[PDB]
Design a protein around this ligand. Structure first.
Ligand SMILES: *C(=O)[C@H]1NC[C@@](C)(O)[C@](O)([C@H](CC2CCCCC2)NC(=O)[C@H](Cc2ccc(OC)cc2)NC(=O)[C@H](CCO)NC(=O)CN2CCOCC2)O[C@@H]1C
Ligand SMILES: *C(=O)[C@H]1NC[C@@](C)(O)[C@](O)([C@H](CC2CCCCC2)NC(=O)[C@H](Cc2ccc(OC)cc2)NC(=O)[C@H](CCO)NC(=O)CN2CCOCC2)O[C@@H]1C
Ligand SMILES: [Cl-]
Ligand SMILES: [Mg+2]
Ligand SMILES: [Mg+2]
Ligand SMILES: [Mg+2]
Ligand SMILES: [Mg+2]
Lengths: 195, 225, 196, 222, 204, 233, 211, 196, 195
């Protein structure tokens, strides 16, 4: 719940998401995937309160999958982000809000462009070249201000994420047990299995 | 600073033109004497949107009622409907109101509090400037005032507010409702606070501001062939 | 506030000061605290002004509809409607009402409805913040079957002591006389009652 | 509970020219929505060509000005009538303020005069005695309205040479006393329009090598 | 905790001679953390411009809400909404949420397409309309904008003069606010022309 | 830290061409109960000063004593005690303003607001305010409690600035004060009819008038007010 | 936002110049480095008065030491007078985070972090203040032991610029110091207003910004 | 508690009820609330029974040491001692004390010290929870220069009424008469004063 | 910070103390030694509130060091522990108690015996074969209750400590940046450099 990153390079969006599920005093798991495939070319990472996070992501995943069957068409990232922001924007004035922050990384097959959207539990949407939820940003936004270019290759984007992961492991009080990393590109969603 | 008093053959309302947000002036020329009916007016103090919304709501319904009954609307009707609606909301609509007008029953003056209490009176003041105003009204009000007298006393009560109360300021709005005559609304009746000419013009040499990019905005519907 | 009602030979008299306060500021110095719920049934109001106006209004509505159908309602019936409202909304009302009226059968009758929404039928009743100062006086000086002039004096003296000692009371002393003769409003200015 | 603090409103403004300084204040004193005085001076001659205002809770501001005036009287006694320089004054006030670090003076303090090179000087202090020398400072209720104006007009901030694309800043200059007073008056007219605690009167104390001169201008009384 | 100062942001609107100007900053943050340096607060329906400061989720929601209402309006009325009418719609729409408000500071700017009369307004979060002749201010540096406007402003400025004034109001007020700046946008609006300019300001 | 118990309401005052006028009602309130109907809250010091005190009566009675003890102390080894070295209003104010501000700083204030009215050696008018916080201010008109809100508006209509003081006679000024006391009696639920008034004039000296009464009270219009809205009877 | 790190060529110190009252920007021209002597520097973060006063007072105590002992004070001894001082005030609400950075022969180039809850740490790299995280990110990612003096100055500068941008409560200008065998050397005030644009253009960084 | 002192031709009388309560429990129904601080200087106590006993005990000490040194103290000097203690310790005290004493010079005097520690010389004085209910009665029935029989009756009627209405008051009415003749202790039982 | 462990074996005591110093959101140092030598054969490890820990450790150090010069003699571990306990037990009823927990590991040269003492900030003393302060105990105690034997060598003590660190690096939420390990035996105090 305490580290989700994304970075949009030339031709892909890379989402990096810690493996640690901690409750109080004990690390319960060190291999947790804080992600759901929304459609073939759209991946949503999430971080926030316990239960709320997966319950929200699995609700959003159902809805986009229902849309994909009904129209026999895949929504643009811009469309899925807008759908999501509105569900959170509706949720914040509820009896019990979803306390969930999300990155949405998508490859728009129409515009042949990678897109990254940071949305917090209030319904605050922003399209970004790089994004982070929670304490991570405090370190990673300065790093990426220094080392990011908009024409970087996917390998260059992965090298840039190692620095973000090194710097968080160096300076952040909690042991988050590393990151699972996923690349969204014109060919869909794949996991880098060594990181 | 809102006030109203009765005179020989009518009733008069006075109000300042200042709106505050914490300690800053949000507005120097706001109209606190709201229209309800042609010859029924309502001075507003308290939460500004609440005073504006509740006078518009009752004013809308009084119009439908006037149409329905084919009669000139009465002040006691505006009074009852404001008071029942404020009462329902238990103070949460933070509106303090002085209601006055002419109807077929004669001339009327009433105060309304946020919790839904009403008062009857020959002279009334409300809001942060009400004690400044009530001191002038309690010094100078008598029975069978002429209109020239009435307008002098009402405008003096609002000035007490403007000068002595930080909550009140700028200009004096007045509204006169005499029997068998058209109500006259006298916005900026007094203008005793005109900003003095500035020492300098701060108009900049063109190009002073650094600009990154320009672009034309398309505001028209359909650029067409 | 200082309010009372006293039964005498010919009917009943309602009394009240005219002071309404918002803390120490006198919001209205000529308040009419004697309110008509029917031709010959009036009440004295104390507590939240908003609350007791809303209540007296509803009661006037109920007694007007009563009269349309069943004719002139008893003083008891006016007390009963006040009680019903006060008791069932006790968690959101600050109302302390004295009900007083004239029938030709029952003659003059006083009921008091304190903050409980309980009902009490009494020869006389005092209520409001100013009433605490005049329990002693009123208990010593009240008699049954007083004349009209005696009952005007008893109330004028009583409310006068209440006004002197209570900062929340003051102004003119309003009374309403309720007999077979009809409905007589009275007013007594400070320069009369202060020097008693 | 007893609340030992209160707010008398008012607003103050120091501007440092080449061979002079000004310290200005409105003369209005309030509590809540009441005006106490329309003329209660707030900017004092303390001697040694030092003018001083302690704006906020007027009681704490009086206490402090009264203690600094005394500080000056004893520095003459204890150091053979030696002139208390403004930098030395500035440090002395820090110690005065910081003495009460755990029950502060509820004031924002500006002093103005001449440094030991005869050049105009403004010093400026938070309630517990942090201080910096500046060209410019507004204190009190309408500081937030005035300081951006002074940033723009005195220090030529965000202003560039026309036709330089946006790469040559407007070069810094010392303003004349005539020019500074116009800025002061325009700042207090502006503040008075929009802040309900600023008005009635404007008093300006001007400090040159020759001494301490006063100017008084009416402000709107609403 | 205070919704009106989590994200930051400022909007300022001025009238000139046969023109209006509306301008905004580009900052969006989570308090001390800056996040986006491209978050625009000025939207337009037809020729009516709306700037919105406050809670960013409400800034986005209300824009989506006023695009919706102004689209239907146009489909029924068969004409673009006017600044006077749009102002009332905003007030109505804020006051209908009286006891659960949007945490925003809206500002309407535009020219009546019939009368040719320049018009600006501002609102509290529950719809009270302030219809100024001179200028409107909104956001976390509102005090700073009031001070800058009340001194810098003079009536009947030409389009290219009002641009210089309004820019200098925003830029200097943003620089005395921690939660405003990071870039800014100015709209110069004429009856049948609208220029948009990105200002080069300090990035702290 | 305490809370005031027995309290005195508005003290009002103003400068006129030659002297100063100061007035205060004769009531000691115990919350809402109008307990004490004979309390004197204008205390003269010598023949050139009157100190008008509002707030807690116990803290007022203490300040009374401080001032009486001050006269005594000023006499000690002072052959000029009834001449050039007599107490000035400015000396008495500055003593109180010192005490008031030291009591607030020890978080044990005297629960009062104080107007020092008087005339100095050189004939200059003196009017200055001090309260439980040690806040001080001077104005051609000064008032405490309700009087700030209601009296000041009325008295400022006569003396709105400094240049108005020489145009105001003792008859105009007194009439303004006696009117303001009547207003305060209409509109302050913790005031009384019986008041005291002191003029301190640089020629005729200190006049101290006791047992004054508000009169010309207008109640008549009351007989016509019926109910709270729709009632006609 | 303040940092100080050790490298081959001695110590690099860099601070911003902003002071705040909540969201009110109080100044953009504040000094946050006190020059205690020719060989000893203090950085300031937290309570403006707490830092200015007690570090001025630390200078006094460093001067008395060299009068009484005819010897420049050790960085250890100086850092421990401030840390022992604030430890006496612990619980009373002082707010200070500070780095005592200096050279002596016996110690070589030394940095001591000291904060108002009484922590005293020696180390090669510290960043202190609201902006510390932004500074750490740039500094830790470009830091080696053997930077040129020129490069180390630039990094320390660039690390403060990084924090000036992202942190709402940092900015104004970057003040730069270099500590050697020979003592501290000022390397200038750099206004963020001008420095941000030069760095963007020359480095091709800050691609988040409309340039 | 219901306590009063009244000056009459021959000196002064102190009267009190006898009821001490812990909440609604009567801890003592025969309390003597009339306490000697000197041969002819008594007080009536109201408030914290601890606090007023501590005070009366300390004053009895001060007037004993005064008498040793400077002869018989004036009732005024007793009031000042009671005031000095009550004023100076106002934050740790809940004392409402009435002081009454007889000189041959000054005759009957009454001083009252309410909570804050202020002093008030008065022809008569009433205090305690029961006093609220007789402000009206006492004001209407008090005359100056009453006879002993008139003042016993005025006090007996007045406390009779305070007892009827106040639950915190009751039991017997204790009176202490202070004249040239000496010191006379009177008690009145419910079966006398209730039927008044 | 946080984790201080002690293991008493046959002929030595081993203290293990975390190297992290964290303040809020940043790890400020990763090489911190949370130990003062009190005498040549007595070591105190300490954890608790910032400021208090080092001030109380160096306070105890100077006092023992003074005793060592005055008597030209080394106080037993038992004497050092009882002095420390009474300093904390005095502190707990002060205006501002020392919020510090300690382990004292000593080799008593008179009994030729290693001794471990666990003392909390209340002045609660116990002699233990193994000890821990804070959250560490909740894991390491059951581990040692299983693997511990009183007749173990120092090389077996160290292996038994590696088991405690591996488990703490698996199941604790906060990265404590490794441990510094020190052996107290008849020959004195030395630091195991590679762990
Ligand atoms: C004379 O006595 C005048 N005194 C001035 C004043 C300002 O107190 C006021 O009552 C005036 C009433 C008029 C203003 C013009 C339109 C008609 C009503 N009221 C205000 O200006 C009002 C102040 C106020 C704020 C809050 C509360 O309750 C908490 C009471 C009064 N101002 C506003 O409401 C501003 C207007 C913004 O432009 N907005 C807010 O206060 C926003 N908050 C409202 C409360 O809920 C939270 C949001 O005039 C009298 C007659
Ligand atoms: C880098 O990370 C910078 N972050 C910015 C900032 C502002 O937080 C700060 O710490 C800066 C430190 C320098 C030190 C050298 C002198 C200039 C300031 N701090 C402040 O500017 C400070 C913020 C602050 C306020 C309050 C507290 O504790 C309550 C801690 C920090 N400002 C002030 O203290 C203002 C200055 C106004 O001119 N004054 C007050 O806050 C007044 N109150 C002080 C507390 O007691 C009540 C009165 O710089 C770092 C390095
Ligand atoms: Cl009423
Ligand atoms: Mg009264
Ligand atoms: Mg103003
Ligand atoms: Mg900024
Ligand atoms: Mg910044």
């Amino acid at each position: 719940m305490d580290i989700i990153l994304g970075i949009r390079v030339q031709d892909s969006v890379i989402l990096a998401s810690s493996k640690a599920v901690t409750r109080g005093i004990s690390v319960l798991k060190d291999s947790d995937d804080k992600t759901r495939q929304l459609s073939p070319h759209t991946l949503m990472s999430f971080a926030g309160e316990a239960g709320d996070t997966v319950q929200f992501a699995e609700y959003i995943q159902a809805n986009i999958q229902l849309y994909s069957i009904r129209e026999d068409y895949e929504l643009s990232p811009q469309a899925v982000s807008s759908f999501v922001r509105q569900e959170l924007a509706k949720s914040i004035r509820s009896r019990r809000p979803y306390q969930v922050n999300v990155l949405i990384g998508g490859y728009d097959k129409k515009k042949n462009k990678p897109e990254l959207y940071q949305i917090d539990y209030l319904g605050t949407k922003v399209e970004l070249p790089y994004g982070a939820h929670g304490y991570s940003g405090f370190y990673t936004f300065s790093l990426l201000d220094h080392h990011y270019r908009p024409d970087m290759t996917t390998e260059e984007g992965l090298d840039l994420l190692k620095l973000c992961v090194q710097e968080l492991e160096k300076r952040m009080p909690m042991d988050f047990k590393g990151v699972i990393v996923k690349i969204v590109d014109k060919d869909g969603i794949r996991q880098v299995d060594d990181f | 600073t809102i006030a109203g008093l009765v005179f020989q053959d009518g009733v008069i309302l006075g109000a300042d033109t200042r709106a505050t947000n914490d300690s800053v002036v949000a507005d120097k020329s706001c109209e606190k004497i709201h229209f309800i009916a042609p010859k029924i007016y309502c001075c507003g103090a308290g939460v500004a949107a609440d005073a504006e919304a509740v006078t518009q709501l009752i004013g809308s319904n009084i119009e439908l009622h006037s149409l329905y009954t084919s009669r000139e609307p009465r002040v006691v009707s505006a009074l009852q409907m404001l008071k029942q609606h404020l009462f329902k909301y238990q103070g949460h609509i933070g509106a303090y109101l002085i209601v006055a007008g002419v109807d077929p029953t004669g001339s009327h003056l009433f105060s309304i509090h946020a919790h839904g209490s009403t008062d009857v009176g020959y002279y009334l003041s409300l809001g942060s400037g009400s004690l400044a105003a009530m001191a002038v009204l309690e010094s100078h009000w008598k029975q069978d005032l002429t209109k020239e007298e009435a307008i002098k006393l009402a405008s003096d009560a609002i000035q007490a507010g403007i000068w002595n109360d930080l909550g009140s300021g700028s200009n004096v709005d007045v509204c006169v409702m005499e029997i068998g005559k058209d109500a006259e609304y006298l916005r900026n009746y007094l203008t005793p606070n005109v900003r003095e000419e500035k020492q300098k013009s701060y108009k900049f040499p063109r190009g002073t501001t650094a600009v990154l990019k320009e672009s034309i905005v398309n505001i028209c519907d359909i650029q067409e062939e | 506030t200082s309010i009372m009602a006293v039964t005498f030979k010919d009917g009943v008299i309602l009394g009240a000061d005219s002071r309404t306060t918002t803390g120490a500021y006198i919001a209205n110095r000529v308040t009419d605290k004697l309110t008509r719920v029917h031709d010959k049934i009036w009440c004295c109001r104390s507590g939240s002004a908003a609350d007791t106006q809303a209540i007296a209004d509803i009661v006037q509505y109920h007694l007007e509809l009563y009269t349309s159908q069943y004719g002139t309602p008893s003083t008891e019936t006016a007390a009963s409607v006040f009680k019903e409202l006060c008791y069932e909304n006790k968690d959101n009302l600050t109302a302390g009402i004295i009900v007083a009226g004239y029938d030709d059968k029952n003659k003059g009758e006083v009921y008091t409805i304190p903050l409980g929404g309980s009902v009490h039928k009494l020869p006389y009743a005092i209520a409001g913040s100013g009433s605490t100062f005049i329990y002693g006086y009123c208990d010593k000086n009240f008699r049954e079957n007083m004349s009209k002039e005696e009952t005007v004096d008893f109330i004028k003296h009583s409310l006068s002591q209440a006004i002197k000692w209570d900062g929340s009371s003051g102004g003119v002393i309003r009374m309403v006389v309720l007999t077979a003769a009809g409905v007589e409003r009275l007013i007594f200015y400070p320069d009369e009652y202060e020097q008693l | 509970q007893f609340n030992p603090y209160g707010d008398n409103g008012g607003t103050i403004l120091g501007i440092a020219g080449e061979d002079f300084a000004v310290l200005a204040g409105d003369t209005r004193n309030i509590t809540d929505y009441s005006i106490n005085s329309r003329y209660e001076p707030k900017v004092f001659d303390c001697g040694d060509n030092i003018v001083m205002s302690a704006n906020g809770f007027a009681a704490d501001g009086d206490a402090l000005v009264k203690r600094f005036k005394n500080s000056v009287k004893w520095y003459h006694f204890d150091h053979n009538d030696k002139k208390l320089s403004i930098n030395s004054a500035a440090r002395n006030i820090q110690h005065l303020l910081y003495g009460k670090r755990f029950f502060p003076y509820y004031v924002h303090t500006i002093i103005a005069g001449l440094d030991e090179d005869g050049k105009g000087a403004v010093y400026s202090f938070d309630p517990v005695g942090s201080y910096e020398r500046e060209q410019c400072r507004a204190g009190g209720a309408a500081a937030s309205l005035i300081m951006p104006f002074l940033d723009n007009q005195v220090n030529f901030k965000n202003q560039y040479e026309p036709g330089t694309n946006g790469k040559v800043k407007k070069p810094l200059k010392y303003l004349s006393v005539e020019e500074v007073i116009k800025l002061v008056r325009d700042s207090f007219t502006s503040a008075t329009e929009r802040h309900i605690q600023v008005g009635d009167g404007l008093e300006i104390l001007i400090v040159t090598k020759d001494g301490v001169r006063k100017e008084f201008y009416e402000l709107k009384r609403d | 905790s205070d919704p009106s100062s989590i994200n930051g942001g400022i909007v300022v609107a001025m009238t000139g001679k046969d023109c209006v100007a509306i301008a905004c900053d580009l900052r969006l943050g989570s308090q001390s953390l800056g996040v986006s340096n491209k978050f625009e607060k000025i939207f337009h329906y037809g020729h009516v411009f709306l700037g919105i400061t406050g809670l960013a989720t409400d800034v986005t929601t209300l824009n989506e809400m006023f695009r919706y209402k102004t689209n239907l309006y146009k489909l029924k009325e068969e004409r673009a909404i006017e600044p006077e009418t749009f102002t009332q719609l905003v007030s109505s729409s804020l006051y209908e949420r009286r006891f659960g408000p949007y945490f925003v500071g809206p500002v309407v700017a535009g020219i009546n397409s019939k009368s040719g009369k320049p018009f600006i307004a501002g609102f509290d979060l529950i719809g009270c309309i302030d219809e100024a002749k001179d200028f409107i201010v909104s956001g976390t540096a509102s005090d700073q904008l009031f001070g800058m406007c009340e001194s810098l402003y003079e009536p009947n400025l030409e389009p290219e003069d009002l641009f210089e004034t309004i820019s200098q109001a925003l830029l200097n007020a943003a620089d005395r606010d921690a939660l405003s700046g990071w870039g800014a946008v100015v709209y110069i609006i004429k009856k049948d022309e609208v220029v948009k300019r990105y200002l080069k300001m300090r990035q702290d | 830290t305490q809370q005031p118990i027995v309290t005195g309401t508005s003290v009002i005052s103003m400068k006129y061409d030659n002297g100063v006028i100061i007035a205060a009602d004769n009531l000691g309130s115990y919350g809402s109960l109008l307990r004490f109907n004979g309390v004197e809250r204008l205390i003269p010091v010598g023949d050139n000063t009157v100190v008008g005190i509002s707030g807690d009566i116990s803290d007022m009675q203490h300040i009374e004593r401080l001032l009486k003890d001050l006269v005594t102390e000023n006499a000690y080894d002072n052959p000029l005690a009834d001449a050039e070295e007599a107490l000035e209003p400015s000396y008495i104010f500055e003593y109180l303003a010192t005490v008031m501000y030291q009591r607030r700083s020890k978080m044990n204030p005297l629960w009062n607001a104080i107007i020092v009215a008087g005339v100095q050696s050189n004939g200059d008018q003196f009017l200055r305010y001090v309260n439980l916080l040690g806040v001080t201010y001077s104005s051609p008109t000064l008032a405490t409690g309700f009087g700030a809100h209601m009296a000041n508006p009325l008295l400022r209509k006569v003396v709105d600035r400094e240049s108005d003081i020489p145009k105001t006679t003792v008859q105009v000024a007194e009439e303004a004060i006696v009117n303001a006391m009547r207003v305060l009696y209409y509109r302050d639920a913790r005031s009384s009819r019986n008041f005291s008034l002191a003029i301190i004039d640089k020629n005729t000296g200190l006049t101290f008038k006791k047992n004054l009464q508000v009169e010309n009270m207008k109640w008549d219009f009351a007989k016509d007010i019926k109910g709270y809205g729709t009632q006609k009877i | 936002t303040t940092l100080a790190f050790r490298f081959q060529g001695g110590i690099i110190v860099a601070v911003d110049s902003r002071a705040t009252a909540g969201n009110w920007v109080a100044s953009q021209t504040v000094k946050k480095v006190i020059e205690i002597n020719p060989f000893l520097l203090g950085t300031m973060a937290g309570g403006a008065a707490d830092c200015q006063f007690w570090e001025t007072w630390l200078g006094s105590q460093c001067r008395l030491h060299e009068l009484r002992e005819k010897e420049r004070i050790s960085v250890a001894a100086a850092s421990k007078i401030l840390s022992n001082l604030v430890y006496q005030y612990k619980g009373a609400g002082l707010s200070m985070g500070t780095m005592i950075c200096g050279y002596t022969r016996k110690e070589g180039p030394t940095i001591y972090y000291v904060d108002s809850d009484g922590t005293r740490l020696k180390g090669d790299i510290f960043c202190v203040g609201s902006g510390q995280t932004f500074a750490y990110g740039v500094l830790d990612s470009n830091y080696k032991w053997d930077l040129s003096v020129e490069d180390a100055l630039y990094l320390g500068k660039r690390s403060i610029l990084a924090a000036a941008h992202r942190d709402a409560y940092s900015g104004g200008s970057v003040n730069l110091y270099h500590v050697t065998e020979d003592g501290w050397i000022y390397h200038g005030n750099h206004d963020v207003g001008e420095l941000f644009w030069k760095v963007k253009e020359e480095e091709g960084s800050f691609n988040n910004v409309i340039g």
